[PDB]
Write a protein that binds this DNA or RNA. Structure first.
Ligand SMILES: [Zn+2]
Ligand SMILES: [Zn+2]
Ligand SMILES: [Zn+2]
Ligand SMILES: [Zn+2]
Ligand SMILES: [Zn+2]
Ligand SMILES: [Zn+2]
Lengths: 836, 836
DNA sequence: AGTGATCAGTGGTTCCGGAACCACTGATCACT
DNA sequence: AGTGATCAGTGGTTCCGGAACCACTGATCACT
């Protein structure tokens, strides 16, 4: 059986009609913009999700004709849990299995002395008696109250047992036995208690190991790990400005120490002798939104003073397995956790219960390794995971949940993944497939393309040049006759990415020293300037930590004298050799309808002035503003410049319809009359970057921003192509162009976080190109990449590792691609060998 | 492959572990209470839904260990669309295909004169010219302005065409041609216009046939069909009581016609001369929640004065196909609509476009027939469909949507279905299966059980007697060795339901005459009294209409002098032969935690008094109230009687935990000390109906209500079994017992709407039994049923039909089962033959 | 000349709680 | 004796809108 799309014309799709094989690893490929995400995500996923949800208890319809074989679909991608209560543990369901394990095996200790607790059955004490006492001894059985009094004979077994038990009933689980002869006394408990102090540990159940249960969570943090401590970002007195009388009362006591109308001893205003600003705003928090107000403004979430950030109460933290309480265990990297579960030797009475439990835990602990997250710890906040880390956890969870019958759609799951781990991701993708799921992956990575069960190539190119199936079938087929597609060619060899054959050398260098932020091993980084630098290393090695959470803020402050948070470090040297810093991370473009490529990269400004220079617009009052659809005056006022009004009808969601006044041109007739070389302002939003780049050859300032958009490959996009309809690789690329178009000083530092995300072989080519051009002008470019085609072109490389997590944070290697490719201390080098 | 439940212990499930075959028609069967709904719905569906939804963009966990092979699951059952905009058409997606059809073919007429509109191409008029005019004529081509002036020669074809076109450009689609020789003039339009009046019909598109589009809906009702007309349920002046000054102004003008402080001429207060109460409260509606206030209270939704309730604007209503505008078409029963589409003979140029469209519409129009809803019309409000009608529409839609890979779980889909249509439902169930879905049906119907690909029988009996797989495998297997289950036996023949062999005769009769409510053909029903009556007939025949929406309210008013709405009719006769009327419809029990069987059927009252009679409770102040957990005094005040407190934690949903004070017994220690025959009040909520029925043999009033619960089969339920945890066949049965326990007059009328819903062969037996016992005491019992085992036992039958919809509403037949089984004018009789 | 650092105005996101309404319990009144 | 027709108190359902917050456009100022 197979999935059968027919009449697919979403976005730029050209009414295509493709048969996708069910239960296979299908990779959909294509140059960024081609619209293969519009087929994977906005058609297939979007309909399989729809058809399902609308069959439930309902509280858009993707433009397709029909789709046979469609199944409930799930999209996996970069989507953070947001709430403070999610750990890697909880999110993968693994923590729960753990909560049961610690419940079943694992001994409680004393919540204060740490001494292992003790309890005995009536079996165990009846047996104690016959060891400590001589058969024939006359004994008393008490209840802390005479219960029985007899002779310790084997013949009296049940009498003893009956009385032993009764003694615990009345004794509240406590029974005393006296050796009437010797005077020796023995007190016992059918329940857990400390020998050194006599306190009764709680009821051992999974609920106790749950920092999301009243039974498990810490008393003064509710299992969150942190509390809400007011922060001296409260200083006129910033949090008092909703009642002037407040500000005055303290001013009157200030004038009582002899001051008007900041002078030393500010410590009083802040604490008191009476009531300080701090404890007062802290009291307002307890004694009460306006609870929300003070959370956003004056409050910093600090670690829980009591549990230490361990979330669990004092008791739960006292149950141990081979020395580790459940939290301690979740702190081991998921691979240490694994071995711990293995070098675990439990009595066979124990290994009889745990048994399968223990296997169930290890099976999905592995799915985490198999996806390359073996460096994480379950204790890890879901909150603080990269997008790629999130993406691969959903993959492991979903393959763990063993759900079957669905169509999974993944967008570029190699994001954040070293070339070294690609092998294992493909192996997990195929496993998620062998549960009997259709796995559809939008990817650009060759290794993944080569492992596809079926490929579908969309193009030829972006925008109107896409929406067509330029190839479909097997890998062998595509490599047997590749003349058919740009993807086929980059695999065949026809097109390739050139290793610039001459390395560059610096003119100065940057030296950030003693970098201790996160897992970075108190390192000393020297960054060559005026060269193309790369930062590589396996996931978890510390790339983002160093480059983006330390190096970046730090320069921003030594350059803009600003107060940005940054990673721990000792010093920076030679920062005067750069005089501006531009950064482009992976975050998403702000999407409004009031925005298109032209307005976003600002070229439209220059174009608005050109139109306001036309004799006709000079003849009238017209200036540049007349030509903005976001400004009253020359836009269409029916639809406020939108090109559509909003029709309000009863009992239905609002529906937007074309503006009948302006026809959706979104300008008033008068403005549409001003023309340059024959076209009005609306006509100019209809042309592609390539079209506009021609039209404007002679207008230098315009042609420039345009050229950039063309150079990054975006040359095929409509200027007015609204921001919302923008694809991911475009939007990133526009955000890219928006920065790359501001003239450079010749000594600016460009920081790029995985710039090749959402980029095809082809787009990457134009990219490394543009980047080379940037350094020639004496500019420094740092990129964090796992993409080998971008790494071959660096003149310097700083390789972090050797592994991820706590087993990384080391500069394992540095030098040119070549110096790195000979270094056997580096994985990056081990793969950089087969491209040099 | 197969689904594999392991460690299933939801509700009364006994930790069972069943393998269900994937892609099969699986019927799960069992005596009502057995907990087979807890496995179908609360385990399988509940998890397949969960695992899916939690994989999406999340904004309980059914107690099971593991479930392999699980797929996204969908439950189909009695669940109304609630909104005023849903029709059968829209809900099945069929209307949309229709909107396209009327767009593609189907001629517009004049929105007022009804004269078919006309337009011509430049091709059509160029050709007209050469017919009307003699080749050689000199002509002028105008624009309503001389465009051209030439000679009508074939040699001038393009000149004419070019000018013809230009003439329409400037002419606004209008071109005039003069025969300069003859004086004859011809005006043409490239667009639709009326020859008799010259108005331009709108842009013909699907959006125009959409009463949910600004383009399609009616102007003064927005495609809803009705408006909001204030109703004289406004009379001190009920809608003026939020401003006394109002009531006074009118009182001062009343005292100006000479009245204080109702006297004839009330018409003024209501309308004015100045402003009446009605137009004013009507003005408050337009000129403005408090819009909501007046909707609930003083306003009645009346039909739209303009569109007539047709929803569509005047234009859309003017496009016709073979004489019918799109609404007219949706009024035909889905089977007339079908034939209409067939006896439709469209020109081959037409049948080339519509072609597949027309087939796509007919395919799913059939799924409606195949499920037995051929009697409906697309125009039918989704709002006013029975639960069973809803259920089978989702089935047709879902089989229409061709979705595949999911597990469908249906609860008793024969609800509302005549025995005659069961054949076709099974055929649809198997079709929904052959798309490659697992179809799991909780059913009791033998015909469906016999068509199962795989059966799973749960029991032995209800409550603690269930939760076990008492058989699984094929139909043949079960009938080859049936000694294994109560279901197996009712098929084998071992157990059977006896046709009471002696019919009863009335002592009087009820005669409701001229019943015209809904589709009932102005009929005259005579109801025999003191006998067991049944009302039968195919879905849509009018059973609910007659018995429940006319007969019922009508008696309620002639008995309670109340003002209930009722179906249209002329008169009632002999209503004095009954002096009380009890009714039990299919609606659901109000579910609170403050309720159990014992409190619901009120027996717990009698039990509370017994406990307040105990010497110990007499010795103290205690009365009956002390023994209610819903009253302050003797319940547990920690948990307000709930048996659990609510723990509020941060950032997580509330979690309820056992009350540590009362241990979940929900009474304070003092009360728990009063005992009767050795058990406190809590202990008595723990015992089953059968247990309690023993315990209380000698307490007559108690034993009675209990006996009822035992007689309907409910003898196995915990008295304190909370209302929420109640199954459907139980809850209905409790609601049943709650009425059947009030002593009868000996002349009360009992009306039961499908009382055998959610009932097993076995429960039906105990039911017809109880019902017989009720008539012996001279009581009249009317039941609406399709269940043949209940119908064999009637002494009279009133068969409605012969079909559903407008082709029903006739009393096709009456008499005893036998008199009916010989009547070939009746389907009921045609199946009642094989059980007599 | 081109910038960045601003500000107003505007759109997208997201992240929650109440009011009204209806059903059940368990009491009394007004009775058969 | 047991009812139904009441009423208060309480729980379940359901059916919605704003405020705050953040991003983008496109202007001016203060400059290189
Ligand atoms: Zn201790
Ligand atoms: Zn804490
Ligand atoms: Zn407009
Ligand atoms: Zn007309
Ligand atoms: Zn209307
Ligand atoms: Zn309690």
């Amino acid at each position: 059986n197979e999935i059968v799309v027919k009449g697919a014309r979403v976005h730029n799709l050209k009414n295509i009609t493709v048969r996708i094989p069910k239960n296979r690893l299908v990779v959909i490929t294509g140059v960024s913009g081609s619209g293969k995400s519009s087929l994977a995500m906005d058609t297939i996923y979007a309909e399989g999700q729809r058809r399902y949800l609308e069959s439930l208890s309902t509280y858009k319809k993707p433009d397709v004709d029909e789709i046979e074989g469609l199944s409930p679909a799930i999209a996996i991608d970069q989507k953070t849990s947001h709430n403070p209560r999610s750990t890697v543990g909880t999110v993968t369901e693994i923590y729960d299995y753990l909560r049961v394990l610690y419940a079943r095996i694992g001994k409680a200790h004393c919540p204060e002395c740490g001494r292992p607790l003790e309890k005995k059955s009536i079996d165990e004490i009846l047996q104690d008696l016959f060891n400590s006492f001589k058969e024939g001894s006359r004994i008393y059985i008490l209840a802390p109250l005479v219960v029985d009094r007899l002779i310790l004979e084997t013949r009296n077994e049940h009498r003893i047992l009956d009385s032993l038990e009764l003694a615990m009933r009345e004794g509240k689980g406590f029974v005393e036995i006296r050796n009437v002869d010797t005077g020796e006394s023995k007190i016992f408990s059918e329940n857990l208690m400390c020998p050194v102090c006599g306190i009764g540990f709680p009821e051992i159940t999974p609920k106790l190991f749950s920092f999301n249960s009243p039974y498990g969570a810490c008393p003064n943090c509710h299992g969150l790990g942190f509390t809400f401590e007011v922060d001296p970002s409260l200083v006129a007195i910033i949090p008092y400005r909703w009642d002037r009388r407040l500000s005055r009362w303290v001013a009157r006591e200030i004038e009582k120490r002899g001051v008007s109308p900041p002078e030393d001893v500010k410590e009083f205003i802040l604490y008191g002798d009476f009531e300080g600003v701090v404890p007062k705003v802290q009291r307002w928090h307890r004694e009460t939104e306006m609870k929300e107000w003070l959370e956003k403004n004056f409050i910093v979430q600090r670690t829980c003073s009591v549990c230490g950030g361990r979330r669990l109460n004092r008791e739960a933290l006292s149950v141990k397995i081979n020395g580790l309480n459940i939290h301690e265990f979740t702190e081991l990297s998921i691979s240490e956790e694994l071995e711990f579960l293995k070098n675990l030797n439990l009595t066979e009475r124990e290994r009889e219960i745990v048994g399968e439990l223990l296997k169930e835990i290890e099976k999905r602990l592995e799915f985490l390794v198999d996806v390359g997250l073996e460096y994480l710890t379950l204790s890890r906040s879901a909150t603080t995971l990269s997008g790629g880390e999130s993406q691969r956890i959903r993959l492991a969870t979903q393959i763990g949940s063993g759900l079957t019958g669905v169509i999974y759609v993944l967008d570029e799951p190699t994001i954040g993944l070293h070339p070294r781990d690609t092998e294992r991701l493909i192996k997990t993708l195929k496993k998620l497939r062998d549960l009997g799921n259709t796995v559809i992956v939008v990817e650009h990575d060759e290794e993944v393309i080569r492992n596809a069960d079926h490929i579908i190539d969309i193009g030829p190119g972006g925008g109107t040049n896409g929406g067509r199936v330029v190839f479909q079938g097997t890998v062998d087929e595509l490599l047997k006759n590749p003349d058919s597609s740009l993807t086929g060619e980059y695999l065949s060899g026809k097109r390739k990415i050139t290793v610039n054959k001459t390395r560059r050398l610096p003119y100065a260098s940057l030296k950030i020293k003693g970098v201790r932020h996160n897992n970075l091993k108190n390192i000393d980084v020297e960054i060559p300037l005026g060269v193309f630098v790369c930062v590589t290393g396996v996931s978890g090695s510390g790339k983002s930590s160093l480059v983006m959470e330390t190096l970046y803020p730090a320069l921003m402050n030594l350059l803009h004298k600003t107060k940005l948070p940054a990673g721990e470090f000792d010093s920076i040297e030679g920062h005067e050799n750069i005089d501006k810093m531009i950064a482009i991370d992976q975050s998403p473009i702000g999407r409004t309808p009031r925005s298109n490529p032209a307005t976003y990269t600002k070229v439209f400004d220059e174009i608005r002035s050109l139109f306001a220079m036309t004799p006709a617009a000079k003849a009238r009052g017209y200036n540049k503003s007349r030509f903005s659809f976001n400004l009253k005056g020359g836009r269409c006022e029916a639809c406020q410049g939108q090109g559509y009004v909003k029709i309000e009808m009863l009992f239905l969601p609002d529906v937007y319809v074309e503006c009948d006044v302006c026809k959706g041109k979104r300008y008033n007739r008068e403005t549409l009359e001003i023309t340059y070389k024959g076209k009005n302002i609306s006509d100019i939003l209809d042309m592609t970057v390539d079209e506009a780049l021609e039209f404007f050859k002679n207008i230098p300032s315009i042609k420039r921003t345009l050229q950039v958009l063309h150079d990054v490959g975006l040359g095929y996009v409509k200027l007015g192509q609204p921001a919302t309809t923008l694809s991911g690789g475009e939007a990133q690329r526009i955000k890219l162009a928006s920065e790359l178009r501001k003239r450079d000083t010749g000594r600016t530092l460009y920081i790029l976080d995985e710039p090749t995300v959402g980029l095809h072989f082809e787009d990457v080519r134009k990219l490394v190109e543009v980047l080379h051009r940037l350094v020639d002008r004496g500019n420094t470019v740092i990129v964090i990449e796992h993409n080998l085609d971008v790494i071959k072109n660096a003149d310097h490389i700083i390789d972090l590792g050797p592994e991820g997590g706590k087993e990384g944070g080391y500069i394992v290697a540095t030098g040119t691609p070549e110096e790195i490719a000979k270094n056997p201390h580096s994985y990056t080098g081990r793969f950089l060998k087969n491209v040099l």
